[PDB]
Ligand binder design. Sequence first.
Ligand SMILES: Nc1ncnc2c1ncn2[C@@H]1O[C@H](CSCC[C@H](N)C(=O)O)[C@@H](O)[C@H]1O
Ligand SMILES: Nc1ncnc2c1ncn2[C@@H]1O[C@H](CSCC[C@H](N)C(=O)O)[C@@H](O)[C@H]1O
Lengths: 250, 250
Amino acid sequence: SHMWIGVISLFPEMFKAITEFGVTGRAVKHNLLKVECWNPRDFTFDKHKTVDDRPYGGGPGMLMMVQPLRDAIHTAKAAAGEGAKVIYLSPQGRKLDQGGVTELAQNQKLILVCGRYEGIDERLIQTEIDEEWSIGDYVLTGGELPAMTLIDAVARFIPGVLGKQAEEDSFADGLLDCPHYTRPEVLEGLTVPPVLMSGHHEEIRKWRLKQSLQRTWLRRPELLEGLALTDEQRKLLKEAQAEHNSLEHH
Amino acid sequence: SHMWIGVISLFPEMFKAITEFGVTGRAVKHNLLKVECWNPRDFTFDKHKTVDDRPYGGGPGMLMMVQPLRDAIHTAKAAAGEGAKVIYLSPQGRKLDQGGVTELAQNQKLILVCGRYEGIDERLIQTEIDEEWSIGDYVLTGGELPAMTLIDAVARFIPGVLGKQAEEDSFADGLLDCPHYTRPEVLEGLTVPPVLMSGHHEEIRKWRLKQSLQRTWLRRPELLEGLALTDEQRKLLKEAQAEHNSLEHH
Ligand SMILES: Nc1ncnc2c1ncn2[C@@H]1O[C@H](CSCC[C@H](N)C(=O)O)[C@@H](O)[C@H]1O
Ligand SMILES: Nc1ncnc2c1ncn2[C@@H]1O[C@H](CSCC[C@H](N)C(=O)O)[C@@H](O)[C@H]1O
């Protein structure tokens, strides 16, 4: 085992999406990744298990009820033992990116608090949360999907998780990935770049790095401006741009 | 019914995460949102239902097998009838944001192609995809979570989906949301801003807009620079900054 993740959520079963399918399901099944959930609903005392409450100053929407949510978080922290980083999923937190992913991957223990409705009391955040994280500048119905997004992302780093089907993928080296092809040789009248059929290992390597650089330049120029390229990368980028400026475009 | 979403995925059951829980589950259960899936595996012809293949030029990783994936996509398009926008979930696509969400919400029909492994043949993308979308600058194990992220986001716009527990949330007006409080009056020694207890509707309104502006200014200044504030917003932003510059900080 390498990573334990505690989760606070009103919809615990949603997490089977990552715990029972694909490489993440595999990682969980083989104890490389542990995911335990605590539902605030189970900590309610009223006959109707109320997990929401009215915000002071009213307004539209409801907030998660404090007591049930706080008790679930404390219970989760009790099981986590010491060293767990408590994270609140929020569109107002640090926007996630590969760098943030690798940073989060360093933790051995995590606790992810998933909100619902309008969110949670701001005092809870100040007193129970270590960091706030967002998966992007958009709003979802709850923290569950974002929490799973975070888990899936950091799971790719746990040793033994990925197989023969990672270090070449987008943002890995700060660059987008190159295009890839497979059978058939001709698809809808389109062929595979001859070099990928030539079997020239070194040439194929350069073609891929060149494409990785060109695509980053064309789609995410700001990324290039941020990276410090090696001599070879600066040479392949020059060639990729030169090749592009040599052809007609749409 | 208002939106039909066709999905191509090797793990169809993952989608129960959104189709059977919360407001999205509710929206599906009540036919406001329709989600149909097609698994490429069901289109395989070999004894072992192979859905992956070796990339030309080799390298690490596998690609989704073309024929099974292409047949699933065509079948999905056949059911979609005409007018469906075909989307490929990819970390190299247009980065998602609220604006993009509202744009995507205009479509009545969507088809979301979820990749696995290293991805899919670049020719398939050129011949079957209308647009590529990313949920953020990080890499996940598959397109399923990103696809669900997209669905959940656009579902918030379908009429009848959200209830009394949306227009006040972050990015709605381009600004982050304000803090919110609920019972108890005192939490861990922390009290609720008196104004939220005063019951002064107009004052509470300004407090919320001011906080929304201050938080955006402090956390996402670039967003402010992009927005065109109204007179009242420019006045409340001035006050929020002035109030902040009047206190000690950590
Ligand atoms: N972009 C995203 N990243 C992480 N969590 C998100 C998210 N979008 C929504 N959430 C989660 O889903 C919940 C319901 S959305 C309510 C959001 C809140 N009023 C705001 O504007 O800050 C939030 O409490 C949060 O836990
Ligand atoms: N940020 C994200 N947004 C949308 N889809 C993503 C994603 N991260 C991963 N994927 C999805 O999961 C799949 C496995 S990840 C393989 C990614 C590919 N080599 C690249 O670098 O472009 C991708 O095919 C895609 O469908």
